């Protein structure tokens, strides 16, 4: 009877399904977080995950900060931690290393799949909208013209999204991906959404149709404040805005690569340097916008401040939300809209830390929706979330859509458009 760093404790079906409500036990997926939300990656019939299980990923092992994500999910020493994977043997180095940090409640449980998958008495849970947010594997099926599940059309295009940055693109893409500038959708005059017929002709020139499967990433390459353009350098975010004005154009299948780029070189898939040329379409096929109730203009959000079914969101960091900095080099007023729900977001303008794991893949969502919930941001409201200028509202709201949340959208104008206007009121300081 001693702690053996390297020999664990098996937890058998029985004993784990007897403490699926304790509070003192842990249940740790190591899998990926694509399987996680939903993806059955094994050919699995039910996807997901334990109910209750939260999601650490065995890949993050190498990453040097990981006992402190351990910490701020509230994973203690005191707790039973059980963990498990599609194998037993995939849980070996994360039960050791829990071990090596102090955790002497440690168990490994072996019957997860196909067991516990496989039977529907042992209850799992799923991100409902999961299929939206794609792996690697499943994008590298689609371009390779081979069998994937959640996907039955007949046309794709993987889209690399960025801010005036095409090196972002030429130093590294996706094989047979084309790249969208962000200015190719908004505009730079107000920051927000083009009209329709620019849409439609942007999105043509692209070769993008209403019918057409969008899989859109972008590269983060570490943004700068001090830089000029520091939006050059947070692709992935301007992914997810792009997928924001696709989906609100008309496109009907548009699908996020989790991670963005960083998680198609993690998978080991070869990459390409091809300046790859577009293929034109002549119709988008769909009156635009198809789904306007996505976006959210200032009148509207000014009547949802008044409103008791409806809210704003603020998805800023907190220097912004006390009127310490604007955000940004080209927005001179500091403060906050009165009245919005704040959401921090991250550290600055260019980064999503409080939405985001390490790797960039979205943050597991039993914690947003926890986090959003403790602040009154619950699905039974309309809510519109915002930012500086809807690149990180467009996150946060695609996160909220992933959840199947029935009526979000993004207030496209935000600090920007609402401090353009010196007779709209604002807050400064801490609340
Ligand atoms: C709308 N642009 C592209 C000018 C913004 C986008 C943005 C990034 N993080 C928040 N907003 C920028 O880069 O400042
Ligand atoms: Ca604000
Ligand atoms: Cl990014
Ligand atoms: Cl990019
Ligand atoms: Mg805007
Ligand atoms: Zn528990």
Known sequence: ??????????????????????????????????????????????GGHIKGAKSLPAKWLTDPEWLNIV?????????????????????????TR????????????????????????????????????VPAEWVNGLISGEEIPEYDNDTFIVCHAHYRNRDAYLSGHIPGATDMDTLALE????????????????????????????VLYGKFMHPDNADEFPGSAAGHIGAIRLAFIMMYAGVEDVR?????????????????????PKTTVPEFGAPIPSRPEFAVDIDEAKEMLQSEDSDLVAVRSYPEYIGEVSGYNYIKKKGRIPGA?????????????????????????????????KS??????????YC????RGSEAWFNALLMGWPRVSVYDGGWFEWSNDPENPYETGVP
């Open 256 to 276: 996020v690569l989790n991670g963005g780029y960083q998680s198609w070189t993690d998978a080991g898939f070869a990459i390409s340097k091809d300046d790859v």
């Open 187 to 214: 505009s730079p005059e107000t920051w927000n959404r083009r009209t329709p017929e620019e849409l439609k002709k942007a999105l043509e020139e692209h070769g993008i149709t209403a019918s057409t499967t969008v």
């Open 388 to 391: 500086g200028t809807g690149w």
């Open 71 to 95: 910490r701020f999910k509230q994973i203690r020493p005191e707790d039973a931690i059980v963990l498990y994977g599609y194998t037993p043997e995939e849980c070996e180095q994360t039960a």
């Open 1 to 46: 009877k001693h702690k053996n760093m390297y020999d664990h404790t098996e937890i058998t079906t029985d004993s784990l399904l007897a403490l699926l409500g304790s509070e003192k036990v842990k249940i740790i997926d190591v899998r990926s977080a694509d399987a996680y939300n939903g993806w059955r990656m094994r050919g699995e019939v039910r």
């Open 376 to 385: 009154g941001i619950i699905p039974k409201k309309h809510l519109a979330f």
């Open 341 to 373: 729900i704040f959401a921090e977001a991250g550290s600055d303008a260019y980064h999503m830390e409080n939405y985001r794991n390490h790797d960039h893949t979205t943050r597991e969502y039993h914690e947003i929706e926890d986090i959003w919930a």
């Open 98 to 133: 829990f071990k090596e940090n102090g955790y002497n409640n440690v168990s490994v449980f072996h019957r997860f799949h196909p067991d516990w998958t496989g039977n529907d008495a042992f209850p799992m849970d799923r991100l409902e909208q999961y299929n939206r947010l």
